[PDB]
């Protein structure tokens, strides 16, 4: 029984119930994420920006079944083209807008990675990706508005690949947390 999360804390409680088992019902998780109405006071603690690039701020470690984190995107900040390491990845906008660009897995031949589609993720919308859907890049293309997103990855992963758009070549990146539980972790 999926009820509307009343608050971020309530959402987290619900997520622990939805991830109690071994499998993930993606549509239900996505629906619950979407139904949480972003309330900036509830996540201000986690929304720690860096001037030069987006930051990843751990909110909840789940049952070890998932990482829940908040990403803070300054104007013009964006990600690499990346995969998600055999995990589910949900992305819900808490503030602002992000452009998500989808790419196919490259062939072995060095070739330009051509976008296969793009879309604009708007406040409160929840997107979903996994390796079977493809790779993506996420960008805050705004010149005037920071964006903040809530990401849930299951299982948790701390490495992924970045892909060079000119060639499809990939390199392994270790992801770091800017903060954990509201505490800056330099
Ligand atoms: Fe991603």
User: 12: closest CA among 63, 73, 83, 79?
Assistant: 63
Ligand 1 center to 160 CA (angstroms): 9
Q: CA neighbours within 13 Å on the CB side: how many for 45? A: 12
* Strand 126-129 versus strand 159-163 pairing type: unpaired
Rg (CA), the chain: 16
What does 53-79 look like in DSSP terms, one character per residue? S-EEEEEE-TTTT-EEEEEEE-TT-BP
Provide the sign of the torsion angle of the four alpha carbons 7, 90, 127, 18, taken in this order.
Answer: negative
Ligand 1 center to 125 CA (angstroms): 15
Ligand 1 center to 89 CA (angstroms): 7
The structure was resolved to a resolution in Å of: 1.4
Indicate the CATH number for domain 1-186: 2.60.120.10
Greatest Cα pair distance, the chain, in angstroms, is: 49
**How far is 116 from 138, CA to CA, in rounded Å?**
14
What residue spans define the domains of the chain? 1-186
With 0-12 / 13-18 / 19 or more C-beta atoms within 10 angstroms meaning exposed / middle / buried, residue 184 is exposed
Would the annotation count 136 as a binding residue?
yes
**How far is 39 from 54, CA to CA, in rounded Å?**
20
Ligand 1 center to 78 CA (angstroms): 11
Ligand 1 center to 144 CA (angstroms): 23
Ligand 1 center to 171 CA (angstroms): 15
**Tokens 């493809």, residue?**
134
**Helix H or strand E encompassing 105:** none
**Tokens 């201000």, residue?**
44
| Structure determined via | X-ray
Ligand 1 center to 83 CA (angstroms): 6
**How far is 19 from 87, CA to CA, in rounded Å?**
13
User: 20: closest CA among 69, 58, 65?
Assistant: 65
Strand partners, 170: 163
Six token digits for residue 54 = 């987006």
């Amino acid at each position: 029984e999926l009820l509307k999360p009343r608050t971020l804390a309530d959402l987290i409680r619900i997520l622990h119930e939805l991830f109690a088992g071994d499998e993930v019902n993606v549509e239900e998780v996505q629906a619950v994420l979407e139904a949480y109405e972003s309330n900036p006071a509830e996540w201000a603690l986690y929304a720690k920006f860096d001037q030069y690039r987006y930051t990843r701020n751990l909110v909840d470690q789940g049952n070890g079944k998932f990482n829940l984190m908040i990403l803070c995107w300054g104007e013009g900040h964006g990600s690499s083209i990346h995969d998600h390491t055999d995990s589910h990845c949900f992305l819900k906008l808490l503030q602002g807008n992000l452009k998500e660009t989808l790419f196919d897995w490259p062939d072995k031949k060095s070739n330009e990675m051509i976008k296969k589609s793009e879309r604009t993720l708007r406040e409160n919308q929840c997107a979903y990706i996994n390796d079977s859907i493809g790779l993506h890049r996420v960008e805050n293309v705004s010149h005037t508005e920071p964006a903040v997103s809530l990401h849930l990855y299951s299982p948790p992963f701390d490495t992924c690949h970045a892909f060079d758009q000119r060639t499809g070549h990939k390199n392994k990146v270790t992801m770091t947390f800017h903060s954990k539980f509201g505490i800056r972790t330099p």
